[PDB]
From Swiss-Prot, chain B:
It is found in: Virion membrane; Host cell membrane. This is Spike glycoprotein E1. It is a single-pass type I membrane protein. The lineage of its organism: Viruses, Riboviria, Orthornavirae, Kitrinoviricota, Alsuviricetes. N-glycosylated. It comes from Venezuelan equine encephalitis virus (strain TC-83). Class II viral fusion protein. Fusion activity is inactive as long as E1 is bound to E2 in mature virion. After virus attachment to cell receptor LDLRAD3 and endocytosis, acidification of the endosome induce dissociation of E1/E2 heterodimer and concomitant trimerization of the E1 subunits. This E1 trimer is fusion active, and promotes release of viral nucleocapsid in cytoplasm after endosome and viral membrane fusion. Efficient fusion requires the presence of cholesterol and sphingolipid in the target membrane. Interacts with spike glycoprotein E2. The precursor of protein E3/E2 and E1 form a heterodimer shortly after synthesis. Processing of the precursor of protein E3/E2 into E2 and E3 results in a heterodimer of the spike glycoproteins E2 and E1. Spike at virion surface are constituted of three E2-E1 heterodimers. After target cell attachment and endocytosis, E1 change conformation to form homotrimers. Interacts with 6K protein. Interacts (via fusion peptide loop) with host LDLRAD3 (via domain LDL-receptor class A 1); this interaction mediates viral entry to the host cell. Disulfide bonds join 4-78, 26-68.
Length: 51, 100
């Protein structure tokens, strides 16, 4: 069964939902993002230092 | 109807609250093609509740459950099933009425 729900992208805060149907009991679903990471694609152009 | 799943199998559940004259056992049926019951007879203890399994065609089911020298008008709204395709044949008699 396909279900979809937006989850706010806040770190530490939980999110809950119930998936239900006319003849099936409520199935709880819980999400908790403990750390959302934003890694960029990066390459090194150079390195500089004191001369 | 404490639960109804319009499905090929006996996805429908109904509780009958009863006040019997004496405890024992006796039959249960539906004099109509709307619902087909899984079980033939149920046991009763003075006044209490009993469970009947059934499969149904109507989306808005309503049927006379005949039970133990009486009958009760069961009625409710029913929900679609889970899977598109099942691996067994129909148990409930098809009927024209599947309206709002």
């Amino acid at each position: 069964y396909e279900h979809a729900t937006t989850m706010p992208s806040q770190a530490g805060i939980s999110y809950n939902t119930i998936v239900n149907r006319a003849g099936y009991a409520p199935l709880p679903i819980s999400i908790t993002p403990t750390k959302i990471k934003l890694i960029p694609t990066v390459n090194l152009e150079y390195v500089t230092c004191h001369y | 109807l404490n639960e109804c799943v319009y499905s090929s199998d006996f996805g429908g559940i109904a509780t009958v609250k009863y006040s019997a004259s004496k405890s024992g056992k006796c039959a249960v049926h539906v004099p109509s093609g709307t619902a087909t019951l899984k079980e033939a007879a149920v046991e009763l203890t003075e006044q209490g509740s009993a469970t009947i399994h059934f499969s149904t065609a109507n989306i808005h089911p309503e049927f006379r459950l005949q039970i133990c020298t009486s009958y009760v008008t069961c009625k409710g709204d029913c929900h679609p099933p889970k899977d598109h395709i099942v691996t067994h044949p129909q148990y409930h008699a098809q009927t024209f009425t599947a309206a709002v």
